[PDB]
Design a protein around this ligand. Sequence first.
Ligand code: NAD
Ligand code: NAD
Ligand code: NAD
Ligand code: NAD
Ligand code: ZN
Ligand code: ZN
Ligand code: ZN
Ligand code: ZN
Ligand code: ZN
Ligand code: ZN
Ligand code: ZN
Ligand code: ZN
Lengths: 366, 366, 366, 366
Amino acid sequence: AAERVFISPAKYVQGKNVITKIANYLEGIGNKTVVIADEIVWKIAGHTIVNELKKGNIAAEEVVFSGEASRNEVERIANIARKAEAAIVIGVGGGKTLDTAKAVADELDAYIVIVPTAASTDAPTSALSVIYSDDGVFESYRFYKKNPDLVLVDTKIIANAPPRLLASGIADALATWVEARSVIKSGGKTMAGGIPTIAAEAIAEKCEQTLFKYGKLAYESVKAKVVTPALEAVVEANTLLSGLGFESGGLAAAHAIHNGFTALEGEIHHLTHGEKVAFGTLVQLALEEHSQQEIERYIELYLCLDLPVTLEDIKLKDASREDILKVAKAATAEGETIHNAFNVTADDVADAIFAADQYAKAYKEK
Amino acid sequence: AAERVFISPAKYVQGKNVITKIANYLEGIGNKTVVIADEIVWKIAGHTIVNELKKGNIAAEEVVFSGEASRNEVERIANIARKAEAAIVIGVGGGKTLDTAKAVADELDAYIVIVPTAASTDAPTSALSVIYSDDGVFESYRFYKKNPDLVLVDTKIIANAPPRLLASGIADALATWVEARSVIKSGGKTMAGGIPTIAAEAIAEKCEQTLFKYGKLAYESVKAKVVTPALEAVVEANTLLSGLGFESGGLAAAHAIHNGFTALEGEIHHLTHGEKVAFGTLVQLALEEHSQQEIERYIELYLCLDLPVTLEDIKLKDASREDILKVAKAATAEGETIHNAFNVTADDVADAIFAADQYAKAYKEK
Amino acid sequence: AAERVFISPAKYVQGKNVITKIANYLEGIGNKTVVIADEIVWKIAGHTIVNELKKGNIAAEEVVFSGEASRNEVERIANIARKAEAAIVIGVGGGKTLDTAKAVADELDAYIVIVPTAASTDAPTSALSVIYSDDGVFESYRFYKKNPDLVLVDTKIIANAPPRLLASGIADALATWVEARSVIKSGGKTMAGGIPTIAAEAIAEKCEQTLFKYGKLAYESVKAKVVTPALEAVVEANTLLSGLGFESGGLAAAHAIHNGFTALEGEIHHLTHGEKVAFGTLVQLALEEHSQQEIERYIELYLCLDLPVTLEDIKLKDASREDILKVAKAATAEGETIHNAFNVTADDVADAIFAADQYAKAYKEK
Amino acid sequence: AAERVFISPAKYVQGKNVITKIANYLEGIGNKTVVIADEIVWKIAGHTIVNELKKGNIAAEEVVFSGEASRNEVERIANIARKAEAAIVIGVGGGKTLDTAKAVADELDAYIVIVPTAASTDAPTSALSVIYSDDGVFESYRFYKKNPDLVLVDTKIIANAPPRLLASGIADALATWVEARSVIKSGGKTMAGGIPTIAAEAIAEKCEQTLFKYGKLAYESVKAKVVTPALEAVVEANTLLSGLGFESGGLAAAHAIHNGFTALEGEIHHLTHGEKVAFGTLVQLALEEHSQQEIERYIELYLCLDLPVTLEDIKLKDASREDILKVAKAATAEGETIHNAFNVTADDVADAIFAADQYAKAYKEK
Ligand SMILES: NC(=O)c1ccc[n+]([C@@H]2O[C@H](COP(=O)([O-])OP(=O)(O)OC[C@H]3O[C@@H](n4cnc5c(N)ncnc54)[C@H](O)[C@@H]3O)[C@@H](O)[C@H]2O)c1
Ligand SMILES: NC(=O)c1ccc[n+]([C@@H]2O[C@H](COP(=O)([O-])OP(=O)(O)OC[C@H]3O[C@@H](n4cnc5c(N)ncnc54)[C@H](O)[C@@H]3O)[C@@H](O)[C@H]2O)c1
Ligand SMILES: NC(=O)c1ccc[n+]([C@@H]2O[C@H](COP(=O)([O-])OP(=O)(O)OC[C@H]3O[C@@H](n4cnc5c(N)ncnc54)[C@H](O)[C@@H]3O)[C@@H](O)[C@H]2O)c1
Ligand SMILES: NC(=O)c1ccc[n+]([C@@H]2O[C@H](COP(=O)([O-])OP(=O)(O)OC[C@H]3O[C@@H](n4cnc5c(N)ncnc54)[C@H](O)[C@@H]3O)[C@@H](O)[C@H]2O)c1
Ligand SMILES: [Zn+2]
Ligand SMILES: [Zn+2]
Ligand SMILES: [Zn+2]
Ligand SMILES: [Zn+2]
Ligand SMILES: [Zn+2]
Ligand SMILES: [Zn+2]
Ligand SMILES: [Zn+2]
Ligand SMILES: [Zn+2]
């Protein structure tokens, strides 16, 4: 019938203090690298990484990332890297830094090492970058012929990152099963190119189980800045499971709603990718046939993690029907992922956004 | 504490007649390839593949594989490939052909495409080759810095392969959960280098569930030479799930016993890799604490698939204690995988081999 | 209300080849021992033990046990031991040898080591010996102020002992929960002197679970003369769990029926202690309120282990009501254990013996 | 494979007013004893015991225990006992008195009777004493060739002991299953010398079940100073089950953390052994993979029993990372019990101590 496709980064390594073994993971690969990080991350981990590379006689061009994943920034860094004759690109930071590093590596056909300093999105493992305008407006997607070569996740670094970034990552990862399940049921396609494999289904379903079981303990672990088995499990769920699950499992309405928000200008854009996805996930559940108890199971967890569940929480308090319809039209554009699992109109989606807000308010009033 | 590592082939594609899209999956990669297959496989799929490559203006050096994964054969093919300026290596066939192709690709730093023509072992996705002497005697392992770039699995080709080869593949895949579970419980390491990830555990456990649910239907599908959803599920379990699960999930006693058989000369070596692993799996279960019902659940399935469950079935009828001890000493050598999950002596293992044979005989007498 | 009492041997050690560490377990204790075994056991383990003691500079008076646990034999060995100035008594063999060794140790106030060479009864751990006449007729009980100091159980030796002796031991151990449960429910006393403790209840109940789960696998292990985890579990159940469970958990009708058989002369006395107890256990179940399915669960296991379940199997085929009443009167004598859990007459018990035979016959006819 | 070892006191007797039968339990043993108790316990039970011994014509040297289990105190009492020609040592009181009595009995090779007047720790049944400096600083362990000969537990005396001492005993006993389960799973050793037996596993698991079922009722019973079936069950769990379970079942992280506190000076040392173990148990659970609900099940019970669950409760409010690391380094010293079940570093343990405190705080904020 249809072909099933699964893709994956070549190697994923996760553990406490693994950043100190970076020189060991590159011995056979090369001795000239470029390290990309923003100003904050240079202090948190960038210098530590350079030090470890120096101790291994690996050279490192130090690049200060502008802060936005834009074409101009990519061009700029690639030039610096070409000049430096870098064979390895090391991206260090959050989603925008990592997406930029992948683009730079593609331009150079270099080995790419992805070092997330927060478990805030499932960008790390994927074969795509989300490109923005220099001003921070979404512009396009950049797909690659390969997923990253090495994803190196140090849980000590992540235990010290802001709790809000772990909660955002849990939100992005909770969308995984909800969206992949909808694609599996509808016979739709994934970003990998075919129908999901059983491997992706197993991974996506385990992602949700892991988050419900350990998510709150992991959040408390980060608040106390310590590494625990609960945190190790949730960092893997937020990174490897969520990453494989969305890319090879499928996207549907939750991420389409997240994209629809770009049709609006405003304070909503100060929210993180995960915070927007949390609301988008409730909207997808409102478009599905679930009982009140089922939906409340997710609302309860989002609230415990201080994640947004109402239009007021996402800075659209008392938004107008017309504003919501702009989001819905953008979320239902040709090519969006919602069509992989639903046959709905923009009006159906606008109704579901208001419904989700109403269901959350009803829960809160208890 | 410990680091968890997961590795994987870059892309896995599975479906009916996917062999006819080979030219499409290589467009961006190159136009000069080397195709490796044995005499039988050249007729079954090798010519079809070359034809599709020609239609896409991709050149193909045709190589007839000797039949054994040996150093000499690897050297020979690599020379042919260098001369032909091949940038892509396509291995077509069973485990020995695929393991040889990986070695050839490593020598050339070429893109490697693995096209299994039977779902007989979990060799396809792994970053290692098992090397033998020209005469067919195990010699060593060859590990690589990368898993294969593309694994292309055509279920139409596999539906027409001998039922014995599907049963062998199911046997190799049934060892996956039993061995990975034992490594997860003991805190041991995997071939990927660290402790298992939750991803590998989910994959390995789903592997077993898939086989118990669809294995017999898949076997009947192959007997009738047709492709069904049951066959598609079992081919994925035998290839992608079993492959990731053993490599990134862990090996333990079952495969160590399989290796121990090389200490013996005889007709046992005409059995397939999977047939030997089926018995090795029963031995591992006899070394664990399981009730009779648990063990019989596996014996029952092996019998339905015409797989060996007694010493007589593996051509060691009335073998002596001394012969069995040679197997056990080889299976417990320093460096073997049994030590990742058990603290046993050769004598303990020799007793477990006889116990497994006795348990199977007791089941058969019913 | 009532006091609960638990007693136990000081140390229980079980494992493969532990007999070779005997000198190590006695280093601090003494250097002059007496070793008691019958002619058969001297060849199986007695000489091995003496050799290990010699290598440790521990002297050993070698005694050939007559074969019956009688007062005369005890006197004889004690004299030999006194003369030899033995400070340690080592009993090696089956129940009669061990019961004799305990008596000899009591006479001398010596340290006592119990080394069972078959897991055939729960005599090893208990603070009592069953004394017979020189001719093999029950005579009395001999209780001690202490349980044995060291019980050393070598599973390699037991794996090579006759399968019939393991089946007998499983039969003796299956009586444990059935009898202790009846004492716990009736508020009766145990041989330890008080009401059972929760510890004894936990031990007795786990004894039965262990036997149903691993008993058949252990029996098959012995048939093949190998040590497996199943055998290790059942040897512990037959020795430590059954021993603590009966002594500190309570005896009831099953063992009273076993004792009642001494009222008869005949071929029944060639059966083992465990074989007689298996039938006695069915009689106790026939005196309780169980459904047919419950009773058949035990009958099924006894048959699989080749244990007797009918009057014909215990050599009383077509026994007369008068003969059975002699058994019942003896089983209900003042002081017997049946009174700890039942308020029944000899006639009630004679009816239950015929009922058990009828229930077993009904099962066999299926 | 490995040998399993189980050890136990020779006789355990528990019941209301059993102290009045002490003369009866010693009739065959001797007529000259030494009775050890501190000033408070002499009034609560010491005089009553002497009176009962006098009525039986058994002499009794009265010793007032200093209050600390130190070498000097042991020497002092042993001298007094030698002079008195005492053949029996009777220790009456809490853990320190009992540990001292065992040492004195060892010096004299005397029969030892242990009479706990509170069910506050599982010291009663064990073959070891914890020795301190005269000033109250841990010094070493003193292991014996035998467990105590007689443990006599009067529940009437314990029903009148401070509720805090019963809660402490429940805390010590709740660690039993958590620690033994971790040793059973890891294949580690117990204090008895080998791997756990099934008997110890059954005992340890029943210990936890007993405490969850009857612990609160037993605590309320003591508050009202009455003996109830619930109290009888919990006193057995705190003494016999917890005692056998830890010694023959295994120790792991909970008790290692308890020992680590000796690296600190301060008010924490006024807490009881059980109060410290309660926190140590939460730390072990934080090092394991449990869901939030699982961990909260224990926190809820500790709070009901007024046991400490946070660093503030154990007098380390706002302790520094450096202070906690001293505890962790001491808890992970070579030879500590944590290594029997975990492969962790001091840093991993320091993180787990802060995590446990955070999880408890999160529960309390609800
Ligand atoms: N390609 C993909 O598959 C993909 C998937 C999901 C999300 N994304 C992309 O991810 C981006 C969002 O990424 P994000 O949420 O991580 O935000 P981000 O990358 O913009 O910002 C992360 C912020 O956290 C800070 N930070 C990182 N590590 C820190 C640490 N240890 N301590 C303190 N601060 C730290 C950074 O300095 C930065 O200000 C978007 O552009 C989105 O499109 C991409
Ligand atoms: N590197 C690894 O991880 C790994 C893992 C598992 C097994 N292995 C290796 O796999 C090898 C065993 O491989 P195998 O069991 O597939 O045997 P194989 O490769 O030796 O033989 C397969 C046989 O089946 C035939 N065949 C293949 N496709 C066919 C088709 N469609 N129709 C008819 N015949 C067909 C081939 O001509 C050949 O004779 C061993 O050398 C073992 O070490 C390697
Ligand atoms: N004191 C108690 O609590 C207690 C409890 C239960 C049973 N018992 C007593 O146990 C006795 C029955 O004991 P039993 O059933 O073991 O019989 P047993 O001691 O009379 O005989 C065992 C037989 O097995 C043989 N044997 C032992 N180990 C062997 C080995 N490794 N290989 C081959 N043969 C071996 C011995 O030579 C002997 O002939 C009775 O007298 C009964 O009263 C006592
Ligand atoms: N050897 C072991 O296995 C082992 C195991 C666990 C704990 N321990 C040891 O136990 C000791 C702690 O013992 P503990 O918690 O019982 O404290 P403890 O012995 O120091 O004190 C108990 C306190 O309670 C009082 N007390 C006892 N019975 C009483 C009663 N009926 N009414 C009023 N007060 C009464 C005593 O006078 C004393 O002040 C430690 O030294 C620890 O190392 C030893
Ligand atoms: Zn996302
Ligand atoms: Zn703003
Ligand atoms: Zn295999
Ligand atoms: Zn041959
Ligand atoms: Zn018996
Ligand atoms: Zn006869
Ligand atoms: Zn304790
Ligand atoms: Zn103080």
